[PDB]
Amino acid sequence: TCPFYKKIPGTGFTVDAFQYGVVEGCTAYFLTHFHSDHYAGLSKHFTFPVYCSEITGNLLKNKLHVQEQYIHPLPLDTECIVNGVKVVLLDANHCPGAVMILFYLPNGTVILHTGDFRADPSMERSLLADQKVHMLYLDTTYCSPEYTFPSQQEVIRFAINTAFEAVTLNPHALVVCGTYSIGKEKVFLAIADVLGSKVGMSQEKYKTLQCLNIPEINSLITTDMCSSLVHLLPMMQINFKGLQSHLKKCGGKYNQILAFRPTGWTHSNKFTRIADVIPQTKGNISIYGIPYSEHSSYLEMKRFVQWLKPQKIIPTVNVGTWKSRSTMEKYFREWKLEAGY
Ligand code: NI
């Protein structure tokens, strides 16, 4: 049974609610982005209308084989009428195709659902700026002050410099990058670009990347592993055993691997600066954990909400424990008292 925080009151609409069978009274299913916890339940046999971004729509058609007649893509930043209700999709600064949704209820209530997002000051000059929002359904993944991490730019600067240094010292080093979903493609694209290489990967992963409307992508990726010195592998293979084994397969083309694991937050963020990150090393294999986040830090979240001044906040993440729920409610009250809404 669908939880309340996936339902939009005064509408026939649900958000990210495909794993509960037929939801009673749902005339339109919204999908914010193509991550498995959110799409869980969709397949080629799904027969209700789905509303989503153009990029999410390409992934549904090609990867899950949802039939075209049930896929309803909408443009960003554009007022649209769905089942007699005005909606806008806004960029969520998460993974490709991820959106926030504005719902203009027939009784005058305005509702923002962030999906998953990384709040940014640029959102303060989207179509959000033009009217009041009464309720906010908020991605609260990292809603606690211990969650700090650098900007995406700083992390990408660290990665490029690390990779370029290593491969200039040893032209026979291979760079490997882990992945398990869409997102964070800048990591491996930036590295391949500084090295003058294409990124090599499986056919399944090539196919996924072909769905994402990325400019000049045919210039950046390939299924020919032999011609590439940046390889993508499943995240589970990013460990000493997995990498040794992969190095065997390259035919003595390479004698060293440098591997990256983009995580989100990890506790070494409470002590160490990005500049000071060091890898774990076993022989000719080195492995870096890098804190590349596609979710808000605590401070980015707080700033967005204090700018938005919502009347009510409904968390969509960490909702399962009384301790999490009590923690979150305390921060929302702090923010309110400090900003005076
Ligand atoms: Ni996500």
Describe this structure in words.
- By secondary structure, the protein is of the alpha/beta class.
- It has 2 domains: about 1-145 and about 295-340, Ribonuclease Z/Hydroxyacylglutathione hydrolase-like (Metallo-beta-lactamase, Chain A), CATH 3.60.15; about 150-295, Rossmann fold (3-Layer(aba) Sandwich), CATH 3.40.50.12650.
- The chain is built from 8 helices and 18 strands.
- A 7-stranded mixed beta sheet has the order 13-12-14-11-15-17-16, sandwiched between helices. The chain has a 6-stranded mixed beta sheet with strand order 6-7-8-9-10-18. Strands 1-2-3-4-5 form a 5-stranded mixed beta sheet, with helices on one face.
- Strand 8 (about 100-105) and strand 9 form a beta hairpin.
- Helix 3 (about 150-170) packs parallel to helix 4.
- The longest helix has 18 residues, at about 150-170.
- The chain is globular, with a radius of gyration of 22 Å.
- The structure holds nickel (II) ion.
- Nickel (II) ion (NI) binds near residues 33 and 116.
- The site of nickel (II) ion has 4 residues, from loops.
> Biggest β-sheet, characterized?
7 strands, mixed
Briefly, what CATH class of the largest domain?
Alpha Beta
Anisotropy-based shape: globular
Tell me which ligands are bound.
Answer: nickel (II) ion
CATH superfamily of the largest domain: Ribonuclease Z/Hydroxyacylglutathione hydrolase-like
Structural class comes to: alpha/beta
CATH architecture of the largest domain: 4-Layer Sandwich
**Per CATH, what is the topology of the largest domain?**
Metallo-beta-lactamase, Chain A
Which bin fits the share of residues in helices?
Answer: 25-40%
Number of helix segments?
A: 8
User: Over all CA atoms, what is the radius of gyration?
Assistant: 22 Å
Order of helices and strands: EEEHEHEEEEEEHEHEHEEHEEEHEH
Our measurement of the CA-to-CA distance between the termini, rounded to an integer number of angstroms, reads: 35 Å
Number of β-strand runs: 18
Strand content: 15-25%
The domain tally reads: 2
Task: Describe the strand arrangement of the main beta sheet, using strand numbers.
Answer: 13-12-14-11-15-17-16
